[PDB]
Each structure stands twice: as C-alpha cells, then as structure tokens.
Amino acid sequence: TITDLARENVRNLTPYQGDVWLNANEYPTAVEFQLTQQTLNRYPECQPKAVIENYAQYAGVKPEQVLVSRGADEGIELLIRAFCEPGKDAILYCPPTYGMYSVSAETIGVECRTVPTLDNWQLDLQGISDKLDGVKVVYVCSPNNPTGQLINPQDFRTLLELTRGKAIVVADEAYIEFCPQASLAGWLAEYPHLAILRTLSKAFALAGLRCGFTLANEEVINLLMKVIAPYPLSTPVADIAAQALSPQGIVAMRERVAQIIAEREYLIAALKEIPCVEQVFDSETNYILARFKASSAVFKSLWDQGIILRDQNKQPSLSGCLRITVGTREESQRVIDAL
Amino acid sequence: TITDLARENVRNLTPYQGDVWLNANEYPTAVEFQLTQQTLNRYPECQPKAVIENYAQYAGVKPEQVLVSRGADEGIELLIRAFCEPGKDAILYCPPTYGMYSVSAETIGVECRTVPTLDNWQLDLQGISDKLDGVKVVYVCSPNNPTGQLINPQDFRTLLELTRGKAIVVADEAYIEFCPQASLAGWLAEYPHLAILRTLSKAFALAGLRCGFTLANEEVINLLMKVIAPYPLSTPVADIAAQALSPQGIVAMRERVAQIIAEREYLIAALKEIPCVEQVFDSETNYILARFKASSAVFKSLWDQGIILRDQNKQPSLSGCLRITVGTREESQRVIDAL
Numbered sequence: 001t002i003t004d005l006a007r008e009n010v011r012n013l014t015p016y017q018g019d020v021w022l023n024a025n026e027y028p029t030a031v032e033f034q035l036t037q038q039t040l041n042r043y044p045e046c047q048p049k050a051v052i053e054n055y056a057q058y059a060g061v062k063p064e065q066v067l068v069s070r071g072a073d074e075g076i077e078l079l080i081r082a083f084c085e086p087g088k089d090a091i092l093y094c095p096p097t098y099g100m101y102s103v104s105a106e107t108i109g110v111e112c113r114t115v116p117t118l119d120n121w122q123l124d125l126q127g128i129s130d131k132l133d134g135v136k137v138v139y140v141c142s143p144n145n146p147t148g149q150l151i152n153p154q155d156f157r158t159l160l161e162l163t164r165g166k167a168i169v170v171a172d173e174a175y176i177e178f179c180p181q182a183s184l185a186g187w188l189a190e191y192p193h194l195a196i197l198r199t200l201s202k203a204f205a206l207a208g209l210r211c212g213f214t215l216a217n218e219e220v221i222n223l224l225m226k227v228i229a230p231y232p233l234s235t236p237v238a239d240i241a242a243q244a245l246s247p248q249g250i251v252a253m254r255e256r257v258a259q260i261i262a263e264r265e266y267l268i269a270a271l272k273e274i275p276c277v278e279q280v281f282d283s284e285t286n287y288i289l290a291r292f293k294a295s296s297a298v299f300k301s302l303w304d305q306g307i308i309l310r311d312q313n314k315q316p317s318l319s320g321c322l323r324i325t326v327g328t329r330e331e332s333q334r335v336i337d338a339l
Numbered sequence: 340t341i342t343d344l345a346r347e348n349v350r351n352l353t354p355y356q357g358d359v360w361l362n363a364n365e366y367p368t369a370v371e372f373q374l375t376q377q378t379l380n381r382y383p384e385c386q387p388k389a390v391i392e393n394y395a396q397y398a399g400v401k402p403e404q405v406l407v408s409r410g411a412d413e414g415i416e417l418l419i420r421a422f423c424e425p426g427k428d429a430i431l432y433c434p435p436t437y438g439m440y441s442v443s444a445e446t447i448g449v450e451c452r453t454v455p456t457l458d459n460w461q462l463d464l465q466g467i468s469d470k471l472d473g474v475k476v477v478y479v480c481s482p483n484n485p486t487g488q489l490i491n492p493q494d495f496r497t498l499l500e501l502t503r504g505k506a507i508v509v510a511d512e513a514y515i516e517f518c519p520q521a522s523l524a525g526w527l528a529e530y531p532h533l534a535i536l537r538t539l540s541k542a543f544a545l546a547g548l549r550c551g552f553t554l555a556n557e558e559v560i561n562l563l564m565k566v567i568a569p570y571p572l573s574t575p576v577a578d579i580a581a582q583a584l585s586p587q588g589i590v591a592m593r594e595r596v597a598q599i600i601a602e603r604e605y606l607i608a609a610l611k612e613i614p615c616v617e618q619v620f621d622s623e624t625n626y627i628l629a630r631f632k633a634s635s636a637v638f639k640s641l642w643d644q645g646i647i648l649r650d651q652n653k654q655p656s657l658s659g660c661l662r663i664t665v666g667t668r669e670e671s672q673r674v675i676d677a678l
C-alpha cells in the first residue's frame with residue numbers, strides 16, 4: 001500500500017495534540033491590526049529587514065543575531081535540521097516540558113535523550129552530565145511550560161560549561177516577556193553555543209501570525225539560514241509584525257503583560273482558598289499549574305460547562321495537575337465559581 | 340568551532356539562489372486584499388476549513404484530497420519528509436527543471452537521482468526505468484520551469500505504470516492555471532501514488548502569501564498531515580486565500596491568465612523578429628525561454644538598464660538561454676526596445 005512506502009518513524013508516530021478558552025496560553029483578547037503593504041504579487045524578502053531590526057532593537061541584540069521564522073516551533077525544527085545527523089545524533093530535553101522538542105526529533109528521525117528535572121522542576125545536572133555523549137542540541141524551557149518556574153541561572157552556567165564545544169544549548173524563552181529580567185539574551189557574548197527562542201504568540205498577543213525568532217551568535221544564525229525555506233514569512237505577517245514591534249507597540253505589549261500578572265496573582269490567591277485544590281504552584285508566566293483532587297473529574301466537569309483547561313495528568317510527575325491559562329477577570333471568576 | 344558541530348551536508352551545501360522585474364514568474368500587478376478576521380490572538384486551525392473547501396471546489400476534488408501549506412515549496416519538502424528515509428532512499432528528477440527538488444533533498448540529506456530530459460524536454464522513459472531502484476519520490480514539473488512546455492500525457496501514463504507500488508509521482512502544476520485542460524487532477528481516481536502541487540503564487544497573483552496546496556488521495560494526505568507543522572498557515576494568509584478562492588475571485592484569476600496569454604503571444608512574435616534572438620521556445624505558461632547570441636552580454640546589458648531577467652545559461656542544455664517573465668505591455672516594450 002501507499003503506507004508501506006512511508007518511513008517507519010512516520011508510520012509509527014505520535015502526532016501533535018459561549019465557552020472559556022484557558023488551554024493554549026494565548027492572550028485572552030484580540031489586538032487589531034490592518035495591512036499596510038499592498039504588494040502581495042511579489043515574493044517577500046527571506047528575512048524582512050523591518051521585522052529583524054525592530055526585534056533586534058527590542059531584544060537588545062544586533063540584527064545579525066536574529067532570525068525570523070514561522071513561530072518558535074520552526075526555530076525548534078531548524079536547530080535539529082542544521083545540527084543533528086539523523087540516525088547518528090541525539091537531542092536532549094528534561095520532562096515535564098514543552099512537547100514539540102520530542103515531536104520534531106521523532107518526525108525528523110533524531111534520537112531523544114531524556115533527563116527528568118528534579119522534584120522542584122530544577123535541572124538534574126549530574127544526570128545531564130551523564131548522558132551528553134552523542135547529543136548535539138539540548139532544549140531548556142525557561143520559564144518552563146507547564147510548571148511555570150524559571151531555571152536557576154547558576155545551573156544554566158553549569159549546563160553551558162558542560163556543553164562547551166559539544167552541543168548547542170537552546171533556551172526556550174517563549175514566555176520571557178512575563179519576567180524580562182530573567183532573559184539570557186545578554187549571555188550571547190560569553191557563550192557561542194547559546195541559542196534563544198522567542199515568539200509573538202504569547203505576551204504579544206499574536207499567535208495567529210505564526211511569527212517567532214531565534215537569538216544566537218552570527219555563526220549559528222548563518223548556519224540556520226542554510227536550512228530554512230527560501231521565503232519562510234508571508235508579506236501580511238512581516239507587515240503586521242513590524243507594526244507590533246514599533247516603540248508604541250512595545251509599550252502596549254508591556255501593558256498587556258502587566259494586566260496578566262495582576263490577574264494571575266488574583267487567580268492564584270483565589271484558588272488557594274478552594275477545597276479540591278491541593279496545591280497551586282508559583283509561576284513567572286501566563287498560566288498556572290495546580291494539583292486537584294480527582295483532577296480528571298474536575299477537568300471533565302469544567303469541560304462540560306464550557307471551561308477549557310489543559311490536562312497535564314499524563315505528564316511525568318504531573319499526575320493530578322491541570323494547567324490554567326490566565327485570561328480576563330470574567331474568565332477567572334468563571335473558573336472560581338465553577339470550582 | 341560551532342561549524343564543526345553542524346551536519347556535513349549542511350556545512351557543504353548549495354543555498355537556494357525604476358526597473359522591470361521579469362525574473363521570478365510573479366504576476367506583474369498587485370491585486371489588493373484586506374483582512375476580515377480580527378482574531379490574531381488565537382492559534383489558527385491546522386488546515387483552515389474555508390481555504391480547503393474553496394480550493395477543493397475550484398480544483399474539482401474532495402476536501403479530504405487537499406492539503407494547504409506554505410507554498411508548493413513546503414509541499415515538495417513534506418513529501419520527502421514522509422516518504423524518504425535519509426541515507427537510504429532517493430529522489431528522482433529530470434533536469435533542466437525547478438531547483439527546489441534537489442535543494443530540499445540535499446538539505447534533508449536524501450539522495451538525488453537525475454535523468455535529464457530528451458532534446459525536446461520530454462521524458463527519457465528508458466533512463467528513468469533504469470534508475471528507479473531505491474527511489475521513493477519522482478518529481479515532474481508540467482508545464483516545466485524553465486522551458487515552458489507540457490509533458491506528453493502518454494508518457495505520464497507510462498511513468499505512473501513504472502512506479503506503481505514503488506514510488507510517489509509528484510506532478511508540479513505550479514503553472515497549470517495557464518493551460519487548465521492539461522491538469523492531471525482527474526487522474527487521482529486511477530492512480531493512488533499520484534500527488535499534485537498547486538500554488539497561489541503565479542496566476543493567482545499572491546506570491547507574498549506563501550500559500551500552496553497538495554492534491555492527492557486521502558491516504559497520502561493523511562501521511563502528510565503527520566509530518567507537517569501544527570499550525571503551518573497564519574490567520575491573515577488563510578483569510579486572504581479564502582477570499583481569492585471565492586467564485587468571483589476565481590473569475591478575476593481567469594481574467595489575469597487571459598491577459599497574460601495575450602501578452603505572452605505578443606512578446607513571442609516580437610522577439611522572433613530580433614537578430615540576436617536565435618530561438619524562442621513555445622510555452623504554456625507565464626514565462627518564455629529564448630536562446631540569445633552572447634546571452635551573458637545581453638543579460639548584463641539589460642541588467643545595467645534595469646531590466647531583470649533570469650539567466651539559465653548554466654542549466655543542463657540551456658546554454659545561451661534566458662527566461663523572460665511575462666509582465667505588462669509597457670514592460671514587454673522595454674525588453675523589445677532594449678533588445
């Protein structure tokens with residue numbers, strides 16, 4: 001059959017998996033943009049100059065240290081495509097974390113080496129140290145998804161020393177806008193093998209744009225340029241993204257972050273008071289992890305009411321946990337009341 | 340160095356390569372669209388229902404036989420990602436043809452098997468027959484880029500019989516809007532291993548949208564779904580594409596094709612009269628291949644005047660040839676006068 005012609009790994013593959021939507025870490029409200037460049041008949045630039053410069057300014061890096069792609073999801077893939085030789089090289093991640101690291105590698109055909117984090121979700125530096133042989137890329141989400149906490153800077157120094165001249169360390173900063181001070185963007189000067197993933201999908205409130213970035217040293221960006229599609233970004237996206245990255249746009253973004261942090265603090269306080277809520281974990285992001293008694297029963301009940309959360313009950317060490325995206329005060333009340 | 344960590348194939352890799360732009364087969368004039376869906380904060384559907392249904396209607400296929408991607412360029416990559424096992428399987432194309440077939444395979448790490456076409460750019464069926472061992476995907480551009488002619492249907496039947504239960508045959512119909520009658524979309528019923536690439540980049544005049552499609556049998560589309568990025572299309576693109584694919588939009592498209600065919604016929608007639616023009620090849624597309632005496636001298640001279648063409652002097656059997664995209668009457672005159 002046609003299926004018999006497909007690659008084995010593709011044949012046997014784990015495909016990525018009135019109501020309130022608090023399940024995908026998206027900003028709760030739509031920010032409106034309108035096209036300004038009516039030049040759709042022509043092919044766009046590979047890397048739109050306006051987008052790259054506005055973002056370098058914002059991130060505080062040089063334009064030659066930025067690469068724009070279709071979301072950080074593409075950034076994850078590109079790194080594996082340029083550095084990992086399928087069948088020979090490996091990827092290394094630390095669960096429970098973002099699922100696309102393993103999906104991309106499994107789709108491409110690269111080995112996944114896993115070293116679960118410690119009980120407080122911090123890095124198991126000795127274990128990582130023990131499994132670095134044959135690893136080309138290490139992914140670390142900080143702040144982590146789904147747990148919500150930052151990785152100790154001291155441990156990040158250790159990981160970078162361990163991988164020097166052996167692997168690329170990628171810090172996934174998809175939610176870094178919520179705790180700006182914690183960004184590793186300033187470490188690029190000290191570490192050549194450091195890469196950072198950014199996105200406009202969360203704090204920026206532009207998930208539907210599919211626009212992300214990779215911050216790295218020129219040598220790494222240059223290698224990534226050789227594996228990326230010729231015109232990865234559409235003109236309507238590059239147009240709206242440069243608009244969102246204008247000074248006034250950066251100011252509006254910061255105001256959305258502020259409003260989310262305030263709503264997050266309210267939500268955490270209110271949930272601690274709840275009986276079925278055994279534990280609410282602190283977060284430096286736009287989502288909250290919480291352990292419930294009979295979480296599946298609660299998940300279902302809310303689901304049946306039109307309140308959509310993200311079950312994490314199957315993730316390593318997250319049994320009983322549900323991830324709640326922070327939305328509006330009205331949506332927070334709905335969850336509280338429903339709980 | 341960082342470079343030493345990159346894959347060998349990536350290290351040694353061929354990276355894709357007042358004035359008049361007649362060099363990229365883009366429609367000469369911009370057709371204006373405006374966003375209608377202000378929902379950018381949320382993630383879009385993996386495969387926008389409106390885009391898929393409007394295109395299935397247009398192409399005359401079932402929605403389950405369509406897959407939308409970031410241009411036909413992504414369609415080329417996906418097929419290799421799902422069917423070719425790097426280091427083990429091969430791809431087969433027939434030069435001189437579109438360059439992305441070999442670039443994608445070389446980037447991914449898959450072998451390229453080449454069987455040059457015959458002197459009239461038709462398929463060398465005996466040669467293909469001789470090199471099918473270990474090939475999973477065969478690409479055939481029809482009408483071909485850069486030559487402009489259609490592949491004999493009789494020979495396509497032969498290729499499909501040769502590959503039955505051995506490989507996927509992909510017909511690249513990027514320029515099929517110029518010769519609709521010649522589409523193989525109706526053969527899907529007879530051949531399970533047949534895949535067709537479509538795009539909105541040429542006749543549709545929407546290259547800046549980066550929107551393409553893959554027509555195939557449900558079983559093939561289902562396999563492709565397992566290797567594609569979770570949200571391959573942005574909301575602004577899916578919005579403008581469904582607009583362009585509305586009945587009235589299909590009517591406007593056909594009017595652009597008509598205007599290009601008329602301008603193409605004028606351009607061919609006028610160039611035959613020119614001294615340095617040794618031969619002008621017939622085309623069923625929006626570009627014309629022509630052999631010039633001292634083509635590089637002519638290419639440069641025009642280039643220095645602000646008239647940008649596409650040199651093909653390096654392609655197998657195309658020495659002396661330059662590809663001219665059909666634009667407006669004013670642009671045709673510029674080339675004629677300048678010649």
Ligand SMILES: Cc1ncc(COP(=O)(O)O)c(CN[C@H](COP(=O)(O)O)Cc2c[nH]cn2)c1O
Nearest residue numbers: 024025071072073098141145174199201212569
């Ligand atoms: C930790 C982390 N890293 C990267 C991304 C990618 O976002 P882009 O939109 O820029 O590609 C995300 C975002 N991931 C989410 C939400 O988390 P989850 O519920 O899947 O764990 C949305 C998404 C995009 N592709 C798959 N899922 C991120 O959280």
Ligand SMILES: Cc1ncc(COP(=O)(O)O)c(CN[C@H](COP(=O)(O)O)Cc2c[nH]cn2)c1O
Nearest residue numbers: 230363364410411412437480484513538540551
């Ligand atoms: C024969 C053929 N097949 C596919 C495509 C892809 O178009 P998408 O925009 O839908 O990805 C093209 C278009 N290719 C061109 C122009 O031809 P050339 O001058 O490169 O030979 C533009 C392009 C897009 N990516 C690389 N080049 C096509 O001609």
